[PDB]
Amino acid sequence: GTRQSPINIQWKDSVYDPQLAPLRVSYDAASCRYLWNTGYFFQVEFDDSCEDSGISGGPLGNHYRLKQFHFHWGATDEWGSEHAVDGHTYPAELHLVHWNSTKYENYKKASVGENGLAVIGVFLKLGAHHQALQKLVDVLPEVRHKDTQVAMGPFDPSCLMPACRDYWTYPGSLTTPPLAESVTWIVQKTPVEVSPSQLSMFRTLLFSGRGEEEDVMVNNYRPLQPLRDRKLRSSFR
Template sequence: MAQSVWGYDSDNGPDHWHENYPMAKGDKQSPIEINSKDVRHDNSLGPWHASYDPGAAKTILNNGRTCRVVFDDMFDRSVLRGGPLTGAYRLRQLHLHWGSSDDHGSEHVIDGVKYAAELHMVHWNPKHGNFAGALKQPDGVAVVGIFLKVGKTPKPEMKRILEEIDNIKTKGKEAPFQHFDPSILFPKSRDYWTYHGSFTTPPCEECITWILLREPIEVSSDQMAKLRTLSKTGENEPVKPLVDNWRPLQPVKGRIVRASFK
């Protein structure tokens, strides 16, 4: 089957993904709403640790669906371990989902609260050989999800990424992105929720241990506006703003969300 051009428009958006990617109708799909009353505190969930090599950052790109920073994952340069994970997972890329205005844009929803954006740091388990192999295993991928909340003070953390936006305005544009330590994007608190789910983009493989951080990081409204200047169309096409690249909530179907905190 030819790779269909999925997206977030009415003709190719999340309602249609299952037509080409049947897994999108699976039992362990993401994102979900996290309801505090249903969350189970789990004493056995320890802290997670990330040791990232700033030299592993390679490029930043606009693929027409998100803004992505790509890292060298040929060996264990930048790894995530601990928390709900067994072994070390390698950082491969980070990307964002955001809305057309500041009052929505995150994929996960916490007790009815939507944030302006959600940052995903995608790691894979090298025991499965390569990234493609990891996608086929339930413990193949770990994603740290960080919420972006609009506040008064623009946070310096997002500055590096946003400074590059002008260089990747249109779909297909890529720019060098070197010497970046993504751990600056972590909030102060290490508290998290965790559950087993899927990628929120096709093919929606159900291989992800989610680590969703409780504390959001703050960005300014101007910083969010900058992200919305990206275009989902190519250089010589009419500009269409890249916004609302989030997937709606999926059914929980009996999955338990555990929390590292009370």
């Protein structure tokens, strides 16, 4: 279609919209359930029954409930992010998926509908060890095979976001099938630092299940899509 993601976020295409309300992020860490290997990436799952865990403000018409969050990475530290910024790609990218509780009855239905989801994207960059990320890194050995899952304790995704909350927003799609154009994209300008050793662990996962021949999980990002005549607006100037 015309509203596909990811895209290369370029300065020349950005238009400051001073009308964008403050982005309110409030997650209920207690609603965290398990972490599992989908066969494409690893994803942390939440219990979306809580009407207070989610996001509001910014470009959203109402509150969107947190459902899950995952990551995308490449075979080396030189690439892996889905989105690029003026052509530069980062080692990996974190996606926090929220769904429209107001317009849809549930996440399954939200994910393929008109304004079903709002996804925040955080670029990860090599730097200092990230304390909150370690909690995830430690249980990765338990989910190295496709479809494997491990229970999770309380975890607040906000600990994964950068301090500065300046972003770009635009209409897009899912970056995995069905590639439905149901997403309002919120990408953070400021990348979060993580150490190499933490990033390396992501690469020990496998696309293959138990018994099957070992197929390493790397390069699980979709290639860049054309912006078309979509409005890439920024919350900063």
